[PDB]
Amino acid sequence: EIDTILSTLRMEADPSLHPLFEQFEKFYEEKLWFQLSESLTKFFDDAKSTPLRLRLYDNFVSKFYDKINQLSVVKYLLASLKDSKDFDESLKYLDDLKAQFQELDSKKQRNNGSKDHGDGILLIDSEIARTYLLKNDLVKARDLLDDLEKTLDKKDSIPLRITNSFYSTNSQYFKFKNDFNSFYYTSLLYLSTLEPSTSITLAERQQLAYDLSISALLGDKIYNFGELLHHPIMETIVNDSNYDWLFQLLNALTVGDFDKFDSLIKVQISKIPILAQHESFLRQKICLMTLIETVFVKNIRMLSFEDISKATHLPKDNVEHLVMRAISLGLLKGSIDQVNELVTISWVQPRIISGDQITKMKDRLVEWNDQVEKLGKKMEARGQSIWV
């Protein structure tokens, strides 16, 4: 009796988790499928404590893949296989269920009940790729994710859960490959799409904030840090002093204080080996940010090469390499006149601004208020004889 067999599934269960079993019973009795989904869905959530859930799934819920949301059913294989260190077993169940949906879809049509089976399929494939990243085998990770990405971006309407899985994996992949740019972007998307039904560890969120900070520090094309310093995840790691130097570092960086940063790196540069490598980057990136700011504040935007040299403490030959590279990343637009050694700087990129940097804007705007004060108030007097 899969009812009573189910009751020896209940023998090893914490009886505190038992009261749902009766539900299952009557539900297996009444076969109100939505109610079952509720029941063994939340149950199963808490029965993550129980490997039993496998056979639970593997018995009648295996019978029951016909019933409920495919996101519902697939969540089960997810949390079930989560612990599993047998990867071929995971992939096994995965392509198994897949084949079952190839059947269901083969029979059924769009408005006829097979529409978002595609969704379950996609989600599956996502976690499959995850399994590979766990399996290493890192290439089929890549091609599976990439093949998935098209199918995604053509579908306009898809549940969020899938998307959180997709960026969830891509994050990991780039994290192995150590492409920092791509990692960073994928991350921020992942976070933005994160949902309450996804409960993730505070230790995790701390970590993710850390690796994200590093990425943006070592990222070639990442020059805007306002995203993270104001991003709600940084509030998790903010208070730990073991990391306080880190905010000293980014905070120092977006306000582009050359010397102070240059002090900061001296300590931690010995500490974190990943920082030991890529010191070159950090240096370039500083020179840039410094440049950007010294332009951004300046009333009329032009520079000699000397000015940049002293501001960035860069000998002036490179100064034109520094400017040209500042443009090719999109940070600046403008031109260089060597003959006179000027830099015109058409315009400078809008970038999220912290507190202190605002104040100067307040200033310049007070000036450009005053000029108008005097001009307008000065033009009635003259030509007072002409008004209407």
Partner: protein, 68 residues
């Protein structure tokens, strides 16, 4: 015609994929009874809250011929 929709849509997606189907519009200067009924239909082909705006084609009034 939903077949006209799901036939055209993906024929847009082949062009600029980043423009996603949102909602519909009727240029009729004021609402109709079935409006609230059919928006419920468009909830099939989009995700969040299908947006219905009304373009004023007569222009005879003042500006903002749209209303969202």
């Amino acid at each position: 015609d939903h077949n006209y929709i799901e036939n055209m849509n993906e024929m847009c997606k082949k062009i600029n994929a980043k423009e996603k189907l949102i909602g519909w519009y009727h240029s009729g200067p004021k609402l109709r009874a079935s409006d609230l009924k059919i928006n419920e239909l468009f909830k099939k082909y989009t995700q969040n809250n299908p947006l219905l705006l009304i373009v004023d084609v007569k222009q005879q009034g003042v500006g903002l011929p749209t209303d969202a």
